[PDB]
């Protein structure tokens, strides 16, 4: 302890002299007695001894921690708070205090200066580079942004992006639910307010997806994006006047929302936002099967793909209602460019539909194989 | 946890003199558990298990699923890997998750580290069934040559409503070969080349109606005469738009030079099944 004090008094990079310090303590047999001696010698600080005494106090934790004498560390923490208050508070040594706080070890327990750094203009100064050799300083900065000082996202960006995404998503959901808290008839009068609220909710959801992206929350960003797309559809509804809407729809109301814009390119939004699965055969019984709007089917086709099994199954949905003579060509509206042999071959017999039968099974190169398609 | 480890070490210290091998095995396992406790402690999750809750295996896979629900793909993945809990399925799950978002380059980079393709070049099956699901999960949402780029943001609610009106123009205008030519199709085929084969590359372009480059690759990949037998005749028994098909078969070699048995084995599948009437034309 005397030698350490003498070397410090003589001294009266920062990561370089750490070894010069430690290798002295290495001379000891069991470091606990050395820690006791160093703690006792710490009281020998000279008049105005600040710079050397900083390293002196710093060594106390580096000693007491590796062996974990809890009471010793407790008195050490008391010593650290005392160094902060009795001397450092009058010393105003910002850099020395910062280095000490870095060397806190129990920097998890640095409440005595935690708000001080922000009050000491260290909040943006917390973004000092080359001060995180192990990266823990920035992590503690993030922890402080989460707990000690929540709200100023600027210092947050300077220093969890998932936390920001969740907060923005919560704000967007609150904005979306505020409109739904009132009746549709009551809320329809304030159309401009609806458009503005939809714009704000869309911005909040976009920020949520972006902060999830900065958080690498790919699926969460996607969910925020789907919420934003629904909010934008409601924004057009409140702005372009589409009182036939789909936003904030329940499962039961999903079919009605699809009925708001029945065509596939017009009906995809309700299914996407509320994760609703339309009755492909039963719903498709009304898209083209009875109306012929295989243009809505083409909206689906450029939007998605329907299987041949669904093609042979849609006959059931068509037969499940009163199929007008129009309904035949209505379902077949998209049948020209098709190729399916076996399922259509069975279906034609299922209804004696000589139309497509003559359409396909007539070509000798094709009507010679219609036997293998149907009777084969 | 440091003191916990030290105490466990002392437990081993007292165990060494004991001479009970089974006791030593139990102690080593408990050491493993303490290490895993520390490993989890590196994460600081919403909830953590008891040691008795860790003293049982089932909870390992329990956490394997839980962290998957916790979206800690990297952290949970590393934890499970240290645990001896494999997470290639979690890698594919992350792949699908970014697929729902579009971190496709990073997703591909992470998935190549966990790529499990079928080495057999004749894989007429899922091969990597992960690829089998991923191909659909990707190609179900093709971005064709619509006029809207992947960087259009400020499109007002009117622009969005006009997009709703014009949505069908994105992929209907995408042509037959454009189904294969898409940069989206480029990515899908790249993933295929990563962990898939042509046996399904034919069908993927088939449901999107990409044929010419499909035949070009089929020759380039040497589609088997049995492949051009089944995947043609059985689809032909299901399609029969073969006006283009016999033409393309001749397009391989009009002089019957480089296009020998591809439809010959299909004719085996047909006439062996006594299907010959249009085999006359073929």
From Swiss-Prot, chain A:
Taxon lineage: Eukaryota, Metazoa, Chordata, Craniata, Vertebrata
Gene coding for it: SPG11
Protein name: Spatacsin
Tissue specificity field: Expressed in all structures of brain, with a high expression in cerebellum. Expressed in cortical projection neurons.
Disease field: Spastic paraplegia 11, autosomal recessive: A form of spastic paraplegia, a neurodegenerative disorder characterized by a slow, gradual, progressive weakness and spasticity of the lower limbs. Rate of progression and the severity of symptoms are quite variable. Initial symptoms may include difficulty with balance, weakness and stiffness in the legs, muscle spasms, and dragging the toes when walking. In some forms of the disorder, bladder symptoms (such as incontinence) may appear, or the weakness and stiffness may spread to other parts of the body.
Role, per record: May play a role in neurite plasticity by maintaining cytoskeleton stability and regulating synaptic vesicle transport.
Subcellular locations according to the entry: Cytoplasm, Cytosol; Nucleus; Cell projection, Axon; Cell projection, Dendrite
Residues of the full protein shown: 2054 to 2443 of 2443
Subunit text: Interacts with AP5Z1, AP5B1, AP5S1 and ZFYVE26.
From Swiss-Prot, chain B:
Tissue specificity of this protein: Strongest expression in the adrenal gland, bone marrow, adult brain, fetal brain, lung, placenta, prostate, skeletal muscle, testis, thymus, and retina. Intermediate levels are detected in other structures, including the spinal cord.
Domain of life: Eukaryota
Compartments, as annotated in UniProt: Cytoplasm, Cytoskeleton, Microtubule organizing center, Centrosome; Midbody
Disease: Spastic paraplegia 15, autosomal recessive: A form of spastic paraplegia, a neurodegenerative disorder characterized by a slow, gradual, progressive weakness and spasticity of the lower limbs. Rate of progression and the severity of symptoms are quite variable. Initial symptoms may include difficulty with balance, weakness and stiffness in the legs, muscle spasms, and dragging the toes when walking. In some forms of the disorder, bladder symptoms (such as incontinence) may appear, or the weakness and stiffness may spread to other parts of the body.
Comment field on protein domains: The FYVE-type zinc finger mediates binding to phosphatidylinositol 3-phosphate and recruitment to the midbody during cytokinesis.
Function: Phosphatidylinositol 3-phosphate-binding protein required for the abscission step in cytokinesis: recruited to the midbody during cytokinesis and acts as a regulator of abscission. May also be required for efficient homologous recombination DNA double-strand break repair.
Quaternary organization: Interacts with AP5Z1, AP5B1, AP5S1 and SPG11. Interacts with TTC19 and KIF13A.
Protein name as catalogued: Zinc finger FYVE domain-containing protein 26
Organism of provenance: Homo sapiens (Human)
Residues of the full protein shown: 1976 to 2257 of 2539
């Amino acid at each position: 302890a005397e030698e350490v004090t003498r070397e410090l008094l003589t001294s009266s990079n920062p990561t370089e002299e750490s070894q010069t310090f430690l290798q002295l303590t290495t001379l000891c047999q069991d470091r606990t007695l050395v820690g006791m001696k160093l703690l006792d010698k710490i009281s020998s600080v000279p008049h105005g001894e600040l710079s050397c005494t900083t390293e002196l106090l710093i060594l106390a934790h580096h000693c007491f921690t590796l062996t974990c004498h809890m009471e010793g560390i407790i008195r050490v923490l008391q010593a650290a708070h005392m160094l902060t208050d009795n001397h450092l508070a009058p010393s105003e040594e910002y850099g020395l205090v910062v280095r000490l706080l870095t060397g806190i070890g129990r920097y998890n327990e640095m409440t005595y200066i935690f708000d001080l750094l922000h009050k000491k203009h260290y909040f943006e100064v917390l973004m000092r580079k080359k001060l995180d050799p192990s990266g823990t300083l920035k992590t503690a900065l993030l922890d402080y942004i989460k707990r000690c000082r929540p709200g100023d996202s600027e210092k947050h960006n300077m220093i969890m992006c998932r936390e920001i995404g969740e907060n923005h998503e919560a704000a967007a959901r609150i904005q979306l639910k505020l409109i739904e808290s009132q009746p549709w008839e009551d809320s329809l009068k304030d159309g401009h307010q609806l458009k503005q609220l939809l714009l704000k909710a869309l911005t909040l959801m976009l920020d949520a997806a972006e902060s999830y992206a900065k958080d690498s929350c790919v699926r969460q960003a996607q969910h925020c994006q789907r919420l934003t797309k629904l909010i934008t559809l409601q924004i057009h509804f409140l702005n372009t006047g589409q009182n036939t809407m789909l936003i904030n729809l329940g499962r039961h109301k999903l079919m009605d929302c699809i009925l708001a814009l029945p065509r596939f390119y017009q009906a995809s939004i309700v299914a996407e936002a509320y994760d609703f699965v339309p009755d492909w055969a039963e719903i498709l019984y009304q898209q083209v099967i009875l109306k012929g709007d295989f243009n809505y089917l083409e909206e689906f086709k450029q939007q998605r793909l329907l299987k041949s099994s669904i093609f042979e199954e849609i006959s059931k949905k068509y037969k499940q209602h009163q199929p007008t003579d129009m309904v035949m060509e209505n379902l077949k509206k998209l049948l020209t460019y098709c190729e399916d042999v076996y399922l259509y071959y069975k279906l034609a017999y299922e209804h004696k539909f000589y139309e497509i039968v003559n359409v396909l099974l007539k070509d000798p190169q094709t009507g010679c194989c219609l036997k293998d398609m149907l009777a084969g | 946890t440091d003191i916990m480890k030290q105490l466990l070490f002392s437990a081993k210290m007292m165990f060494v003199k004991a001479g009970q091998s089974q006791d030593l095995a139990l102690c080593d396992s408990y050491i493993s558990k303490v290490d895993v406790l520390n490993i989890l402690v590196a994460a600081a999750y919403r909830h953590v298990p008891s040691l008795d809750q860790i003293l049982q295996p089932a909870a390992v896979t329990r956490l394997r699923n839980q962290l998957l629900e916790a979206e800690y793909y990297q952290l949970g993945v590393e934890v499970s890997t240290k645990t001896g809990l494999d997470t290639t399925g979690a890698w594919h799950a992350w792949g699908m998750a970014c697929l729902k978002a579009g971190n496709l380059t990073a997703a591909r980079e992470k998935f190549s580290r966990c790529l499990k393709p079928p080495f057999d070049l004749n894989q007429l099956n899922h091969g990597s069934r992960l690829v089998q699901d991923v191909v659909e999960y990707l190609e179900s949402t093709v971005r064709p040559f619509v006029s809207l780029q992947d960087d259009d943001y400020f499109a007002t609610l009117r622009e969005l409503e006009a997009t709703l009106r014009t949505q069908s123009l994105s992929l209907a205008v995408i042509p037959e070969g454009k189904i294969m030519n898409n940069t989206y199709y480029q990515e899908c085929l790249f993933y295929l080349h990563n962990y898939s084969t042509n046996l399904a590359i034919i069908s993927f372009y088939v449901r999107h109606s990409c044929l010419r480059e499909a035949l070009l690759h089929l020759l380039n990949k040497e589609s088997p005469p049995e492949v051009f037998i089944e995947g043609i005749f059985q689809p032909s028994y299901k399609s029969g738009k073969l006006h283009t098909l016999e033409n393309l078969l001749e397009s391989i070699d009009p002089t019957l030079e480089s296009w020998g048995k591809y439809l010959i084995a299909a004719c085996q599948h047909l006439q062996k099944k006594n299907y010959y009437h249009i085999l006359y034309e073929l």
